[PDB]
Amino acid sequence: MQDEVVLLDFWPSPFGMRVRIALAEKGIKYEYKEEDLRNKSPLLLQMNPVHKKIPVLIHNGKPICESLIAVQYIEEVWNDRNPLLPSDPYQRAQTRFWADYVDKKIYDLGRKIWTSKGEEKEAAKKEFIEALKLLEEQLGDKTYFGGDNLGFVDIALVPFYTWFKAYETFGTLNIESECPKFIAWAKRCLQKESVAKSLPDQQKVYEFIMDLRKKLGIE
Amino acid sequence: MQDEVVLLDFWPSPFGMRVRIALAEKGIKYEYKEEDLRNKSPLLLQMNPVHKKIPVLIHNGKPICESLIAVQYIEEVWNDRNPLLPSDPYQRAQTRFWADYVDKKIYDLGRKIWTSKGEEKEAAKKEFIEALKLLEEQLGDKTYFGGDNLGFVDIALVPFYTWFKAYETFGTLNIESECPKFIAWAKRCLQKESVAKSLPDQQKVYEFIMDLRKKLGIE
Ligand SMILES: N[C@@H](CCC(=O)N[C@@H](CSCc1ccc([N+](=O)[O-])cc1)C(=O)NCC(=O)O)C(=O)O
Numbered sequence: 466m467q468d469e470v471v472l473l474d475f476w477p478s479p480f481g482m483r484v485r486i487a488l489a490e491k492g493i494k495y496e497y498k499e500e501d502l503r504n505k506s507p508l509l510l511q512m513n514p515v516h517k518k519i520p521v522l523i524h525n526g527k528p529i530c531e532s533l534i535a536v537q538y539i540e541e542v543w544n545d546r547n548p549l550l551p552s553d554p555y556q557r558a559q560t561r562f563w564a565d566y567v568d569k570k571i572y573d574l575g576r577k578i579w580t581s582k583g584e585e586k587e588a589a590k591k592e593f594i595e596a597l598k599l600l601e602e603q604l605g606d607k608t609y610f611g612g613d614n615l616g617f618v619d620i621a622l623v624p625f626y627t628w629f630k631a632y633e634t635f636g637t638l639n640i641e642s643e644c645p646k647f648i649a650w651a652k653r654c655l656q657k658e659s660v661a662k663s664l665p666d667q668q669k670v671y672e673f674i675m676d677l678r679k680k681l682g683i684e
Numbered sequence: 685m686q687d688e689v690v691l692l693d694f695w696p697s698p699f700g701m702r703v704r705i706a707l708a709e710k711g712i713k714y715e716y717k718e719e720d721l722r723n724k725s726p727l728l729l730q731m732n733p734v735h736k737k738i739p740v741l742i743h744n745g746k747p748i749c750e751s752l753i754a755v756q757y758i759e760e761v762w763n764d765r766n767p768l769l770p771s772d773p774y775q776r777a778q779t780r781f782w783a784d785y786v787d788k789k790i791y792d793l794g795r796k797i798w799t800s801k802g803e804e805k806e807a808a809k810k811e812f813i814e815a816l817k818l819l820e821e822q823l824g825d826k827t828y829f830g831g832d833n834l835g836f837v838d839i840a841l842v843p844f845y846t847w848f849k850a851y852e853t854f855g856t857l858n859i860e861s862e863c864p865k866f867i868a869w870a871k872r873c874l875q876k877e878s879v880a881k882s883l884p885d886q887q888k889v890y891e892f893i894m895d896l897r898k899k900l901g902i903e
């Protein structure tokens with residue numbers, strides 16, 4: 466079939482959700498394959514020998530690893546459909562900067578909130594809230610980080626919203642009171658079909674996180 | 685140009701070296717401005733308020749932060765001069781993957797060689813050599829990672845060669861004997877004027893590293 470797209474993923478992975486969103490936004494037919502990360506398939510190990518991680522996008526038999534790299538590949542190949550990145554080089558560089566920011570910070574800071582204790586824990590909490598505020602900043606009055614439509618930064622960032630109940634609980638943090646504009650933005654994203662069908666609810670992820678506390682290192 | 689191009693950098697920085705090579709490869713005249721990372725300038729804090737890191741490319745007064753993002757911006761803007769990335773989306777995705785790989789581990793694996801001790805040091809060293817081997821294998825038969833011309837992966841990676849005397853010494857490993865294909869590749873790169881003009885000698889970097897032993901956590 467005259468285009469084959471397969472996604473190796475694991476449902477609560479925020480990195481995998483980015484690729485699910487980009488696929489749905491582009492209206493791309495694909496096959497979703499769930500991995501058990503305790504028992505990774507020989508397919509996964511062949512397709513991502515370097516990192517042995519999901520997500521892996523497999524397009525006509527060829528793998529693209531690293532979620533943001535896969536989203537950019539999607540943008541460049543499915544170029545006759547909803548653009549996810551700006552065409553102006555400087556604007557594209559800023560878009561990349563903020564996706565990178567999320568990609569370097571939010572996952573790792575979130576995990577730190579619950580692997581640390583005492584004053585180090587409070588340091589990480591402070592930094593996480595500061596990160597949300599900087600992003601709220603960058604968003605301003607816009608409907609989405611992409612403007613009037615979902616863009617690369619929305620795709621990079623909105624999956625992390627699904628981990629918020631876990632961050633709030635295990636990291637002892639009132640995100641909603643501190644950052645109502647961030648929350649409002651994420652709920653706007655959830656009004657898009659491409660996002661709504663790609664993301665699990667906060668409650669399901671929260672339960673899964675407790676089920677994986679040892680591997681996650683809580684606390 | 686006519687175009688104002690300024691690079692805020694620190695001479696032994698491998699990240700800064702990436703941008704230096706890309707500018708030189710495109711034949712772009714630039715002003716180089718050295719930063720003291722112990723006393724970051726108001727200019728630096730203004731241009732990179734988020735990360736407060738070098739390099740920062742300033743093009744006509746506008747900053748582009750993150751070395752790989754700046755290299756891509758240079759490729760996209762100076763698009764009528766020596767291409768640094770492939771035109772094919774899949775090949776571009778692979779170059780991004782391998783640049784990301786370098787950009788992940790090589791700096792951090794290298795440093796871990798000398799921040800750790802005993803049996804954990806031996807692990808870091810093992811993983812580091814393993815990384816170089818994966819890169820030698822990705823290089824395969826080609827003159828450069830970019831083929832017959834320097835490409836994005838060469839730009840991303842070759843700066844780390846300048847830290848090799850430090851890795852070898854402070855990390856107690858014989859890279860030249862274990863990874864001779866890698867070393868042969870780095871020396872080919874150093875024959876290119878754009879690279880030679882941009883990189884300090886291993887000897888100068890080695891001395892600097894000892895001068896910054898406290899800040900770098902050697903060990
Ligand atoms: N940089 C990559 C990051 C992808 C990633 O972290 N993938 C994780 C799953 S989601 C993040 C995650 C990691 C670990 C747990 N856990 O329960 O331990 C849960 C979620 C993975 O495949 N890990 C393989 C492994 O851990 O061996 C990208 O952007 O694609």
Ligand SMILES: N[C@@H](CCC(=O)N[C@@H](CSCc1ccc([N+](=O)[O-])cc1)C(=O)NCC(=O)O)C(=O)O
Binds near residue numbers: 749750751752899
């Ligand atoms: N992700 C960035 C990484 C850039 C980066 O790490 N820059 C370092 C300088 S080179 C890497 C480096 C880091 C630290 C030392 N040292 O001596 O301690 C030397 C070199 C920096 O500005 N650090 C700010 C700081 O240290 O406050 C990129 O790709 O541009």
Ligand SMILES: O=[N+](O)c1ccc(CS)cc1
Binds near residue numbers: 485662666
């Ligand atoms: O919410 N989810 O975790 C989830 C959503 C959509 C798919 C594609 S079948 C897979 C998982």
Ligand SMILES: O=[N+](O)c1ccc(CS)cc1
Binds near residue numbers: 695
């Ligand atoms: O080798 N170097 O460290 C180095 C080379 C070129 C410049 C631009 S003036 C600055 C530093």
